[PDB]
Design an enzyme around this catalytic site. Structure first.
Site, PDB file in Angstrom:
ATOM      1  N   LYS A  99       0.838  -1.207   0.000  1.00  0.00           N
ATOM      2  CA  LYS A  99       0.000   0.000   0.000  1.00  0.00           C
ATOM      3  C   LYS A  99       0.869   1.253   0.000  1.00  0.00           C
ATOM      4  CE  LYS A  99      -2.358   1.780   3.263  1.00  0.00           C
ATOM      5  NZ  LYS A  99      -2.455   3.214   2.903  1.00  0.00           N
ATOM      6  N   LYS A 125       6.954   2.273   2.253  1.00  0.00           N
ATOM      7  CA  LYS A 125       7.454   1.141   1.454  1.00  0.00           C
ATOM      8  C   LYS A 125       8.719   1.559   0.702  1.00  0.00           C
ATOM      9  CE  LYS A 125       4.806   0.622  -2.143  1.00  0.00           C
ATOM     10  NZ  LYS A 125       5.442   1.187  -3.351  1.00  0.00           N
ATOM     11  N   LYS A 174       3.596   8.109  -8.626  1.00  0.00           N
ATOM     12  CA  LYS A 174       4.349   9.288  -8.075  1.00  0.00           C
ATOM     13  C   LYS A 174       5.867   9.266  -8.491  1.00  0.00           C
ATOM     14  N   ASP A 218      -1.996  -0.561  -3.752  1.00  0.00           N
ATOM     15  CA  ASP A 218      -3.279   0.067  -3.319  1.00  0.00           C
ATOM     16  C   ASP A 218      -4.322  -0.932  -3.891  1.00  0.00           C
ATOM     17  OD1 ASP A 218      -2.341   2.624  -1.786  1.00  0.00           O
ATOM     18  OD2 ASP A 218      -2.603   3.868  -3.639  1.00  0.00           O
TER      19      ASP A 218
END
Ligand code: SF4
Lengths: 286, 289
Positions: free
Chosen positions: A10, A15, A41, A129
Site C-alpha cells: 500500500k 514502502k 508518483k 493500493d
C-alpha cells in the site's frame, strides 16, 4: 545468477523508504543492484540519487518523440554504492494504464542490455493500493520471481497484502513468481509484530523482518538519502543490513493461501486493532 | 432533469463518509438519488443501508454465470431517504481492470431502466489514488457531467486533486464533462481552508464547502449510519445540508487549469504544510555533520 525481486505494498506506510534502505544495505555488502520504480508518483529512487525527481521513461520517451529514440544514459542513473536507478513513469492522467507503462520500461531495459550488466539483483518498487491487471503486470510477465510485501498492522495495508497474495495465486500455473515474505514497517502500534507474524502464518509465508520506526530514517530522508549512507553506525542501519542478509539467504518462496474478510477482522480483533461490533446499536438514532 | 455527478478523491481521507452524508441531506431535502459505488473496497453504500457490505455486481454476475443472469432487485437496494444503492465491485485481484467493471455496471443499470426512474441525481463514488484510464471510465464514456473532488490539506490528497483535474481536461476539450468544485474534508490541519481556497482558484474552480472534523461523524459511522439519520439537530448535520444546497444551486462548471508539481509544492510551502528544503544538507553524511 541475477535474482528478480519486487517490493509490493500500500501507499503511505513508507514502502519506498524501506526499499531504498534495503537496496543500500545490499550495495554495502557488495551486490550490484538495479531499482526499477513502478509507482505513479515516481518516488522509488530519490534517496539513492540524492534527487528531487528522476526523469521517467514515459517523460523522456514522449519528448525524444518515442521510446525508439531514447538513450539508456538519459533513463538509467547510478547513485549510492553504484546502485542503478530507473523510473517507469505513471499513467498519463485519465488515459494510461500502469501495465502498459511497466512493459514499455521493461522491454526497453532488456533491448538496451540493462538486465545483463553484472547485476546480482533487480527490485521492482510496485504499488499495491489496487491489485488490478496493470499493477500485477510484473507478475503476469514473470519479471518479479520473488515478491516481498511491505505492510503494517492496519486493515488497508493487510487487505493490500491479501490482494497481492491473490495476484500471485492467479499466475501460479503460469510461471515461477513466488511470495518470499512480509516486511512489517512499524507504525508504533501495540502487537503489530505479532499481528504480521500471524497474518504470515495464515498466508503460508514468513514475516522476514520487522522494521522499527526511528527518527534517523526522517533525518536521512530530509537529506534525500538512506540511513546506510547518512549514519552507517546507527542501530537503524543494522536493521536494514539484517533484512538485506535475510533476503540474500532466503529460500522460502511459496504460493500463498489468501484469507477471507472474516479471517482478517478475526486477526485485527484478536491483536487489539479492531473492537467487537455492538450489533445492537446498528441503525439507531441518539 | 437528472444530474449525473461523480465524487473523486484519494483513499483514507473520509471521501465515502462525506458522499453518503451529502446524499442523505439531499434525500432529507426532497431529492431522489442513486449512489453507484465505484471503489474496489465497495464501501460507498454502508451508511445509507446500515449494512456490513452490499453485494456487488461483479460478485453476483460471476456466481450467477454472467451479468445477463442478474435481476435489478438483487443489485439496487434502497436505504435512508429512498436513496438507491449499487456497488460495481472492484477488479478481480491480479487480472481485472476497474474500468471494465464500472462500464459493465453502468450498461446493466441503463439496460434495466434504473436511470429513467424519476431521478434528481446519480452520484458515482470514485477512487482517485491513480487516475488511470480505468478510474476515468465514468468520464471517458460521458456518464458523469459534474465532477466534485474531496481533498484535504495533505500532500498526497492535493497531488490526487491535481491529477484528477488533468483527467477532466483530457475529455472536457471534446466533451461536456466539467469540474464543479473542491470539497475540503478537514483533518484539523492549520490553514487547510485557505490552501484549498487557493488551489481551487489556481484550478479555475471554487472550494464548494469545508466539511469540519466532528466526533459525531464516528458516533454515526459506528452504527453504520449518516449523521442526518443519527441526529438531525447536530451542528455537523447543517454542515452537510449547506454542502447539499450549494451542489443543488451550482452553475460553475469549468475546464480546469492544472498546475505543475513546482506550483503545487509552493502552495504547500506558502501555507506551512510542506517544509522549505535546506539544500546545503542534501547528500551530507553525519560524518560531514
Ligand atoms: S488495469 Fe489497473 S491500471 Fe490499467 S487501467 Fe485498468 S485500473 Fe488502471
Amino acid at each position: 545468477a541475477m535474482r528478480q525481486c519486487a517490493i509490493y505494498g500500500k501507499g503511505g506506510i513508507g514502502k519506498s523508504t524501506t526499499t531504498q534502505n534495503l537496496v543500500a544495505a545490499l550495495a554495502e555488502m557488495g551486490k550490484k543492484v538495479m531499482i526499477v520504480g513502478c509507482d505513479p508518483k515516481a518516488d522509488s529512487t530519490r534517496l539513492i540519487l540524492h534527487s528531487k525527481a528522476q526523469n521517467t521513461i514515459m517523460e523522456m520517451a514522449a519528448e525524444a518523440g518515442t521510446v525508439e529514440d531514447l538513450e539508456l544514459e538519459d533513463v538509467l542513473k547510478a547513485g549510492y554504492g553504484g546502485v542503478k536507478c530507473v523510473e517507469s513513469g505513471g499513467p498519463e492522467p485519465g488515459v494510461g494504464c500502469a501495465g502498459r507503462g511497466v512493459i514499455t520500461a521493461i522491454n526497453f531495459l532488456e533491448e538496451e542490455g540493462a538486465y545483463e550488466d553484472d547485476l546480482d539483483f533487480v527490485f521492482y518498487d510496485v504499488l499495491g493500493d489496487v491489485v488490478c491487471g496493470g499493477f500485477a503486470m510484473p507478475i503476469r510477465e514473470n519479471k518479479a520471481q520473488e515478491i516481498y510485501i511491505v505492510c503494517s498492522g492496519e486493515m488497508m495495508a493487510m487487505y493490500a497484502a491479501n490482494n497481492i497474495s491473490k495476484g500471485i495465486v492467479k499466475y501460479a500455473n503460469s510461471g515461477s513468481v513466488r511470495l518470499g515474505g512480509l516486511i512489517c514497517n512499524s507504525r508504533n502500534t501495540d502487537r503489530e509484530d505479532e499481528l504480521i507474524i500471524a497474518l504470515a502464518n495464515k498466508l503460508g509465508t514468513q514475516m522476514i523482518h520487522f522494521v522499527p520506526r526511528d527518527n534517523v530514517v526522517q533525518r536521512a530522508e530530509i537529506r534525500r538519502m538512506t540511513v546506510i549512507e547518512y549514519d552507517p553506525k546507527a542501530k537503524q542501519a543494522d536493521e536494514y543490513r539484517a533484512l538485506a542478509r535475510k533476503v540474500v539467504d532466503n529460500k522460502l518462496l511459496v504460493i500463498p493461501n489468501p484469507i477471507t474478510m472474516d479471517e482478517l477482522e478475526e486477526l485485527l480483533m484478536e491483536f487489539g486493532i479492531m473492537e467487537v461490533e455492538d450489533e445492537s446499536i446498528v441503525g439507531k438514532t441518539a
